[PDB]
Amino acid sequence: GLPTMLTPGSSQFLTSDDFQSPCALPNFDVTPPIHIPGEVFNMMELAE
Amino acid sequence: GLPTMLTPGSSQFLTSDDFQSPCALPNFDVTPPIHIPGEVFNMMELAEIDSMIPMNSVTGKANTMEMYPIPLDDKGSATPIFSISLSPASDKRLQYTMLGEILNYYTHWTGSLRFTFLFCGSMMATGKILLSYSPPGAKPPTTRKDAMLGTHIIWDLGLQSSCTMLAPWISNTVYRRCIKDDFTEGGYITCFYQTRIVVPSGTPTSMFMLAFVSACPDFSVRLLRDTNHIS
Amino acid sequence: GLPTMLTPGSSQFLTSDDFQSPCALPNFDVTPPIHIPGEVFNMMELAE
Amino acid sequence: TAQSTPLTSGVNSQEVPALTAVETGASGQAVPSDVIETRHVVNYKTRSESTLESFFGRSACVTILEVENFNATTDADRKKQFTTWAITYTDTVQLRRKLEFFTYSRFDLEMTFVITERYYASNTGHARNQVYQLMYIPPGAPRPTAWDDYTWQSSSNPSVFYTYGSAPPRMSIPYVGIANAYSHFYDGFARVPLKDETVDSGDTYYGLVTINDFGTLAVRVVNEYNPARITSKIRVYMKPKHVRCWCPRPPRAVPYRGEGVDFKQDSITPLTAVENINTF
Amino acid sequence: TAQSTPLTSGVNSQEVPALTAVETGASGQAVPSDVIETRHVVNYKTRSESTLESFFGRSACVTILEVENFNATTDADRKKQFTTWAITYTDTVQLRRKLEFFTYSRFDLEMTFVITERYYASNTGHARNQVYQLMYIPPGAPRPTAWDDYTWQSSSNPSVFYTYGSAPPRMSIPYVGIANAYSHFYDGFARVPLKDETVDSGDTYYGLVTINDFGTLAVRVVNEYNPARITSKIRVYMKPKHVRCWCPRPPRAVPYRGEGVDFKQDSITPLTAVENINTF
Amino acid sequence: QTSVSPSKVILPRGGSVLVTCSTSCDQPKLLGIETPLPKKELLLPGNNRKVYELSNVQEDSQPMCYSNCPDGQSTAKTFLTVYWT
Amino acid sequence: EAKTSYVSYVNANPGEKGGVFDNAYNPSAEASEGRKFAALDYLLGCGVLAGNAFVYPHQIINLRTNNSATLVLPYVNSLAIDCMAKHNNWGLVILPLCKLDYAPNSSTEIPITVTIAPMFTEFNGLRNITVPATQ
Amino acid sequence: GYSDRVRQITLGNSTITTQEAANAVVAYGEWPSYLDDKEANPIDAPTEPDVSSNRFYTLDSVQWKSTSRGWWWKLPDALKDMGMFGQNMYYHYLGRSGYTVHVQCNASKFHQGALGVFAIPEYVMACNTEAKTSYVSYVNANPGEKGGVFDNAYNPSAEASEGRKFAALDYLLGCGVLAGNAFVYPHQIINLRTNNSATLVLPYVNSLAIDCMAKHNNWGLVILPLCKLDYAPNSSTEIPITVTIAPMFTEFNGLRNITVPATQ
Lengths: 48, 231, 48, 280, 280, 85, 135, 264
Description:
Chain H: Belongs to the picornaviruses polyprotein family. Chain D is mainly β.
């Protein structure tokens, strides 16, 4: 169908990667968020 | 999801490839650069720098700081001052220069060379020195009526104390090789006392001369390889 | 990253294929051509 | 396309195309509309496969390389651990004959390495899966003395590491000739033997083989010694692409006997004698 | 491209380019159009391969790591179960020599891990297919004591899990230097030994090796012990890409004897003495 | 790299000395023996092995046998003496 | 048949007098007298059949039609310019296709004289004279 | 009217004039400057000793015999005890400095000789022992004013005591590179028929923006005799090489009490 070629680093599991993945729970209507106080946006908010 | 097909050459590791790869340190705020002086943008910026040839690398004076000064005197012999082939990557006295070490990482080279000769005698020592370049394919020049017929330059001694004999690119191939090859042989180079060097009284008779090597701005290399100095 | 599927005929070496390949000598400044006389453009120039 | 055929009929005139003169050097020039009566044939047949990009568009075989992998004790057993091959297209007789149609050629070369294995003995254990190094050594880089010396680490030499069981490794080598074309035939030496030499180069080889250094393909097995002796075979391939050629020549008739244009005595008779001249 | 060559002819004038003075520090500057008569040569040859992105554009070898996998009983057998390697480029002599052309460099590093296996003994059964952990330990994270301790689980350390038989794992490490460039050569210590110390730091190491901590590459075999002892070899590679360099230096002539710029006594003689000065 | 099998040769004045010089390579680009002594060739099959047939040996000579293997120029000599009454 | 690609310099470059072909291949077992061209006529020297040699630039002197063959040969080489002392560019070949036959005197001799001009020559790299070996 | 051979250099309250000079080498084509605000590593207030330390300092005059083999100075530490630059240095944690190295050696018109005056960034040298590697003490690596000498013989002492020093081998230039390749550095050659002074202008070269001068030695001044001194009546004469160095555009950070390093 499409001529492809496998580079090095294929079929590895890197523990700091950023890939997509199939969701094991398709169409999961997640619980709607509410405004919880004291939201941390960065770990350097805790250094100060 | 998508119909693909694996070509040959998949799952190989080629040591000269150019592929992308996942960064093992995601979001690494790299240290901001500053203007460091003397930035090199190309390895041929280093071929255009002079560097001394160990021309006096005879038995006893090699591997010490007497390898560089070429012996001179006032006797004015017809013998050559020095003689060397034009193989700046595989000759026993050129491959350890700064030009010779870069050429031992490559395989094919073109371009002209620059031999700048510094006379380190006294002030009162005046003289004339023939500097010759002969293209290959004949008798190697030994007497002065053989090297005058090539590409030469007659250099005089005085205030401006550094000549420049240029070895031009005269070659059958577009690219000579970086080995001792017969088919891409470079040329024959000699150096004769033109008249002689004359010293007055109270002045040393036996003197010395330094010899450099660099690359002209039409000098270029190809085909990176390993070297043969280190193991 | 991308959902792919391997067709038949993958990982074969066909001796009459036409694929691309990684150049083992990257940036090789090839020797510039000159006009050599008598250029053949087709093997049927030799049948005539 | 190829040429069509015009609707012509018979002639009776002084314009005579059937008579040429091959003393002048030109070949025949009569197309079949000249000497007979022809119909109109629209010709849709093209010459697309006969072009040089498709005439050389096959991955031919140029050599067969053998390496092994075992506990080497003697010195001959340590030279079975690797194999260095001088790169040339003349170690077979079929890609060579397709290239000696032409005097000069210019092509980017594409190689692919098809590799097999076997057990040597029967009851000496087993072995893990294997990775094969193939290192392109340009002329000047140090050729390996042993199979695990400083030379195989390849800090600048192009190396490929084929895991056994994968698709065969493929790479493209550009036009690396120092001329403006690869001289298939070189009618000259490498040097000029001068008058009254004490060198006495009365053994300089003729012709082609004194100018070609294309490299050395050195192959090791990257594993250490397994308990079972694994004998491998490697078939280096070439496929000329982006092909140009110059100055055509007649093809090779009698067999080869070396890297030159030489020919062996017992096969100087390529033809088979017919019964007589009148044998259909 | 490189420079062409102008059509010049002979001169007779006071403008003399053949005479320079290298006391001033500048090199020679005469191009061959100055001292002889030259034709017009249009130069299409470029310097594209000699640039630093292609001069370092090879995956070199920097070390060879060995791990095993068997039923460990003694303590030396438990230290064969893993291997921790301090990351440096100085454990070989070919990528080091290409980098000691330059004083300072700045490059994103790309690594690839080519891994082999073998059976150790012959008749101790068999083994399943294997998965290899390679964990990048930054300076400060705990180095593993045993092969299965709390450290290998890697909740924040970058780990890769290579299944044996696949394509070799590859990853790109960015510029992680705390300077604005990697100091290949550092002419200084790590601290200042003060006057009248009772510390007596009269064993502080010179130069480079007291500032470089790049990490630790700790490798285990993720399997438990198979009945057959599987001895592995791992070849860590580096390929500098996005390369910049500063302040060039002469290349290494005599061999190394350590991680510094030191040189051993029996190899201080790199040249070979010629017959005389007049030997072509 | 370059081997000369008759290294130690004793032979009287005027006679012929058979010198066998080959290389440890498969392609001898440039190989020969450097002496001012008369020699035709000796017949020997094989692209590598080689024998020159020297003759009219008068004084003590040390001929140099180069061989242009693709790893530099190599060097091998042979030692020959004469005899007199 | 002792060695391959194995011709001396004097035997490969006779100069003015040229060489002759032969209708028999007799390889000398001596490596001395075997350093010369095995000039076999029907294999044209290089082991291709002589009936295919018309793919080269050729003319046929036919003694009923013409008496002179004129060719104009450009510089053909892969390089732009090359050493003439090492490298021989062209090869002039004269094959008798149909043999000479004069009916009164069957053993007559008619001379073939070859007259060659260089054209558009250009030389580089001046030095002392090159004198090649003669033996 | 003007010539390339007469040159006056003034910095602070110090002046060098020279009447037989060659041209001056600005190292890597950059004149030294202060640390710009777009590259500043520390955030404290920088001390700029404007004229108190940007002036010429004259070192000790070594004697160049016919058997003299070379000299070396580490450049931000050969000035460690020179006026206020030696007092700006040890009262501060950070320091950058440009330099104007001026090497002074003159003879008659009957002498001859050559002096390769170099300036080597990160001049890392080799230890004089084979017991350990990268193994030099502090006092032996930082002599200060007097500098060190090269040697034409490599004798590694088997003692780890007397081996904690630079194996200053001349043809391997200390660091095991050949001396004939050292012209890729900013260099001038004092030739006793052409010139009598070598002037270099050295910017601050380091990977960092600013660094500890007490730890880190930026440049390495190297003087190699290429062709030896030869005076025909007196073959064993001595002409002095005097080195005169000025800091330029200095800038310091992190004030505290004085740093006094060890002397043994």
